[PDB]
C-alpha cells in the first residue's frame, strides 16, 4: 500500500526517462550510418604470436607505452611480455592460485592482482632490489573480486562479489568511498578516460554511474535480459558498451542514457565475454563463446571482420592506447597480436 | 641486435625453463572439489583426512592431494563453477538426520543442487563421490515427516538404502558420472580410502582412452 505506489512512481520515472531516450535520439545510431563508408574487409594478420604460457589465460592488460602488456591466468603467473621481440621480462608468483582480475598502472610502477578470495594485492615493479614483492594487500572485503582499476597511483576502484564497489586509498589501506546500490554481484567495470566518473555493471541486468568526489550514484542503465559479462568505456568519455550472455552487445551513452542499437545477429547463439573499442573508434571488438572472435563497427554495427586465431573460449582482449595493435587471448594458453 | 638483446633472450629462456619446471612439479597434485552444504560434517571430514575459499593439502602414500573448500561464498555459482573444470573428483557431503527440520525440507532442496550440477555442460564427465552424515541420529529418531511416499518399514537399513538410492537415482542423462555412494558412519578409520580407490581406478580409466586400448 506504500511500497507498491512508490514502485509505480519509479516505473513512471523510468517511462519519463525512456521518453527522454526516444526524444534525445531523433535518429538512432544505426539510422545515421548510411553516409559513412564501412571499414571494409580488415584482413588482420598475426604479425607476432605470443606463445609460452601453460594453462587457461583469463586476463591481459596494455600499458601506456603501447608496447608492454601483462597476462594473468589460473596457473598462478603474472607475466610481463614485450611487443616486438616477444621475449617476456617479468614473472610474478601469486599467493592465491585462482585469479581473475589484474591491472597495470599507467606509469608502470605498480601492478594490481586479484582473485576470487576477496583479496586484492598490489606489487611494485620498479624496485631497488630489481625484484617484484608485495607492496600492499588491500583486502577489507568479502566475496570475490571481479574488476580492479587504477584511478590514481594511490586511488583504486575495486568491484567485487559483495554487490558493492569500493574506492580505496593504498596509503591508509581503508575504503575511501563505498557503493552499495547494486543488489546482484558485479562483473566488470571500465573507468572514464578523464578518471573522474565510472560505471559499474552487475548481474542484476543493470548498471549504475558513480562519482569519486561524492561517492554516490548518478545514473541508472537497464535493458539487458541477463547478467552483463563485460563492459568497456568509450574513449570520448560520453558513452560505453556492454556485452552479456543475451548475445546482444549494446551501446549506452553516459550523457544520453539511451539504447542506441542491440548489436546482434541471429546466427549468434554465443554469449559475449569481452568488449573493447579503438583509439579512434569505428570498430567494436568482441568475444563470443564460438571460438571465432568478431570485430564489428562502432557505428555501422555490421559484420566487419572475423578472426579465427584461437580454438577455445576467448577469455580476454585489449587494444593498445596508441590504437596500433590488438591482442586477444583464450583458454588454449595462447596470446595473439593482430595488425 | 647487441648484448642487451642476447641478455634478454637468455633471461627469457631461463624464465621459460623455470616455468616448465614449476609446471612439471605442479602437475603431480590431484584435484578434489568439496561441496559441503551447511552442517554437512565439514569439520568432521577435515578432521578425518588429517573469508574466501580455503585451500588444504595432505599426503596419502606416494600421492599428494589438494582440495579447495568453498564456504560462505553466497555468490552465483555459474560465474565460478567453471573455474574447477580441471578438477578430478567432486565430493558431496549430505546429512541424513535432518529430515525433521524445515526452514521445504532441506533433503528435498539438497537434491536440486545434485541434479543441477550433474546435468551441467562443464561437468559432462567428472567423477562424483557422495558422502553421508548423521546416520546414528537418523536411525535413533526414525519417515512420514520427509518421505511419506515411500511408506515402507521404519528399520534403519531399509530406510537408509532407500534414501541413498533416491540420491543416486536422479543422475539425469549423465550416467558416465558414476556416483560413488559411501556408507560414511562419521567414525570410520580412513574414509579417504573411499576416495583413493575411486580416483586411482578412474586414473587408470583416464589412462585407457589415452592408452588407446579403451
Amino acid at each position, epitope marked *: 500500500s506504500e511500497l507498491d505506489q512508490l514502485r509505480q512512481e519509479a516505473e513512471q520515472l523510468k517511462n519519463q526517462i525512456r521518453d527522454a531516450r526516444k526524444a534525445c535520439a531523433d535518429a538512432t545510431l544505426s539510422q545515421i550510418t548510411n553516409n559513412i563508408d564501412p571499414v571494409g574487409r580488415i584482413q588482420m594478420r598475426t604479425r607476432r604470436t605470443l606463445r609460452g604460457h601453460l594453462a587457461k589465460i583469463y586476463a591481459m592488460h596494455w600499458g601506456t607505452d603501447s608496447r608492454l602488456l601483462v597476462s594473468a591466468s589460473q596457473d598462478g603467473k603474472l607475466i610481463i611480455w614485450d611487443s616486438y621481440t616477444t621475449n617476456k621480462v617479468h614473472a610474478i608468483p601469486l599467493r592465491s592460485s585462482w585469479v581473475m582480475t589484474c591491472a597495470y598502472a599507467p606509469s608502470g610502477n605498480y601492478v594490481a592482482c586479484g582473485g576470487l578470495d576477496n583479496i586484492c594485492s598490489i606489487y611494485n615493479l620498479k624496485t631497488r632490489e*630489481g625484484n617484484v614483492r608485495v607492496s600492499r594487500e588491500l583486502a577489507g572485503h568479502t566475496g570475490y573480486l571481479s574488476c580492479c582499476r587504477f584511478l590514481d597511483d594511490n586511488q583504486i576502484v575495486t568491484s567485487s562479489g559483495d554487490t558493492t564497489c569500493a574506492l580505496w586509498d593504498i596509503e591508509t589501506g581503508q575504503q575511501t568511498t563505498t557503493f552499495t546500490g547494486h543488489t546482484g554481484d558485479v562483473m566488470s567495470l571500465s573507468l572514464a578516460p578523464d578518471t573522474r566518473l565510472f560505471v559499474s555493471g552487475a548481474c542484476d541486468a543493470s548498471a549504475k554511474l558513480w562519482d569519486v568526489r561524492e561517492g554516490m550514484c548518478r545514473q541508472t542503465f537497464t535493458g539487458h535480459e541477463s547478467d552483463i559479462n563485460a563492459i568497456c568505456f568509450f574513449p570520448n568519455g560520453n558513452a560505453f558498451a556492454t556485452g552479456s550472455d543475451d548475445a546482444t552487445c549494446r551501446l549506452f551513452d553516459l550523457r544520453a542514457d539511451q539504447e542506441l542499437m542491440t548489436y546482434s545477429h541471429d546466427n549468434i547463439i554465443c554469449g559475449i565475454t569481452s568488449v573493447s573499442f579503438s583509439k579512434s573508434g569505428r570498430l567494436l571488438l568482441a568475444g563470443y563463446d564460438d571460438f571465432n572472435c568478431n570485430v564489428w563497427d562502432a557505428l555501422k554495427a555490421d559484420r566487419a571482420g572475423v578472426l579465427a586465431g584461437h580454438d577455445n573460449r576467448v577469455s580476454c582482449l585489449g587494444v593498445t592506447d596508441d590504437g596500433m595493435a590488438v591482442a586477444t587471448g583464450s583458454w588454449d594458453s595462447f596470446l595473439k597480436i593482430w595488425n | *641486435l*647487441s648484448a642487451e638483446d642476447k*641478455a*634478454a633472450v*637468455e*633471461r627469457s629462456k*631461463m624464465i621459460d625453463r623455470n616455468l616448465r619446471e614449476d609446471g612439471e612439479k605442479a602437475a603431480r597434485e590431484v584435484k578434489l572439489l568439496l561441496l559441503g552444504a551447511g552442517e554437512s560434517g565439514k569439520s568432521t571430514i577435515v578432521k578425518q583426512m588429517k573469508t574466501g575459499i580455503v585451500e588444504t593439502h595432505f599426503t596419502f602414500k606416494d600421492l599428494h592431494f589438494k582440495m579447495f573448500d568453498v564456504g560462505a561464498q553466497r555468490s552465483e555459482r555459474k560465474k565460478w563453477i567453471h573455474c574447477f573444470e580441471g578438477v578430478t573428483a567432486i565430493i558431496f557431503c549430505v546429512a541424513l538426520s535432518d529430515y525433521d527440520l524445515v526452514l521445504m525440507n532441506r533433503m528435498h532442496e539438497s537434491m536440486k543442487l545434485f541434479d543441477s550440477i550433474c546435468n551441467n555442460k562443464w561437468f559432462t564427465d567428472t567423477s562424483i563421490i557422495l558422502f553421508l552424515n548423521k546416520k546414528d541420529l537418523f536411525e535413533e529418531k526414525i519417515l512420514t515427516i520427509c518421505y511419506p511416499e515411500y511408506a515402507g518399514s521404519n528399520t534403519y537399513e531399509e530406510a537408509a538404502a532407500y534414501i541413498q538410492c533416491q540420491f543416486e537415482d536422479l543422475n539425469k542423462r549423465k550416467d558416465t558420472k558414476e556416483i560413488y555412494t559411501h556408507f560414511t558412519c562419521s567414525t570410520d578409520t580412513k574414509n579417504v580410502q573411499f576416495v583413493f580407490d575411486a580416483v586411482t581406478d578412474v586414473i587408470i580409466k583416464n589412462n585407457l582412452k589415452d592408452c588407446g586400448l579403451f
Partner: single-chain antibody
C-alpha cells in the same frame, strides 16, 4: 641498501696468480649480471670482465681474453674472479658493477669500492679535453665524440655517463642520452648528434667535482672514454 664490497687486493708479483671476490647482500644474486671494470691509479678507467645472470655467456677484453676467469656461487650469493699472469696494463682499481639487462632497464646501477691493486682493433672514443676549468653557478657542456655513431637499427643511442666523487665510488647521471637515473637532480642533460655527444651540467657547487666518462654499449667491447677531470 645493498653492499657490493670487494675481497681486496695487494701488491701481487708480476705474472702471478690471485683470487678476488665481490661480497653480495640485500639483492638477488641469481638474477643479476656482474661486471668488473678497470680504473687506472693515476688516470684511466677501462673494462676487465663480465658474467651473465645464468653463466651462459662470458666476455673479456684483449689481454683478459685469456689469463682471467670468473665464477659465481648462488647459495652463498657470492662472486669469484681468478686472475693469472698479471701485467702492468692489467692492474688497476678494479670496480665491481652490478647490472640487469631488460626492457627499460637502467644498467650499471650500482658500483662497488675497488681495490688498490698495483703490481710491483676496437672502437675508440675521445673527449674534448680532460682538464676543463669551471665555475660554480655557471652552465658547462662537456663533449665526447665517437668514430662510429652509436645509433643502432632500433634507434636507441647507447650511452651512459658517470660522476666520480673525490675518493668515492661513481654514480650514474644519465642513461641512453635522454633519460636520467635515481637520486640525481634535473640539472644533468644529454644532447648532440649520433656521432658527437655532449653532456650539459649546470648549477655547479661543491657536490659535483670529479671525473666524467662517456660510455659505449653498442657492441661487445664496452670501451670507456678517456675521461674529463672537472677542475675548479
Amino acid at each position: 641498501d645493498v653492499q657490493l664490497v670487494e675481497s681486496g687486493g695487494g701488491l701481487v708479483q708480476p705474472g702471478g696468480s690471485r683470487k678476488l671476490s665481490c661480497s653480495a647482500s640485500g639483492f638477488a644474486f641469481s638474477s643479476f649480471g656482474m661486471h668488473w671494470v678497470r680504473q687506472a691509479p693515476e688516470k684511466g678507467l677501462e673494462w676487465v670482465a663480465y658474467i651473465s645472470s645464468g653463466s651462459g655467456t662470458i666476455y673479456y677484453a684483449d689481454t683478459v681474453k685469456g689469463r682471467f676467469t670468473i665464477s659465481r656461487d648462488d647459495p652463498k650469493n657470492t662472486l669469484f674472479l681468478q686472475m693469472t699472469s698479471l701485467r702492468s696494463e692489467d692492474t688497476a682499481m678494479y670496480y665491481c658493477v652490478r647490472s640487469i639487462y631488460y626492457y627499460g632497464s637502467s644498467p650499471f646501477d650500482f658500483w662497488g669500492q675497488g681495490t688498490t691493486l698495483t703490481v710491483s682493433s676496437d672502437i675508440v672514443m675521445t673527449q674534448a679535453t680532460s682538464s676543463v676549468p669551471v665555475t660554480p653557478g655557471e652552465s658547462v657542456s662537456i663533449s665526447c665524440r665517437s668514430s662510429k655513431s652509436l645509433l643502432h637499427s632500433n634507434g636507441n643511442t647507447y650511452l651512459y655517463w658517470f660522476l666520480q666523487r673525490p675518493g668515492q665510488s661513481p654514480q650514474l647521471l644519465i642513461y641512453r642520452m635522454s633519460n636520467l637515473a635515481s637520486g640525481v637532480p634535473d640539472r644533468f642533460s644529454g644532447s648532440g648528434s649520433g656521432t658527437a655527444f655532449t653532456l650539459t651540467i649546470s648549477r655547479l657547487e661543491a657536490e659535483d667535482v670529479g671525473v666524467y666518462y662517456c660510455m659505449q654499449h653498442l657492441e661487445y667491447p664496452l670501451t670507456f672514454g678517456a675521461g674529463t677531470k672537472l677542475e675548479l
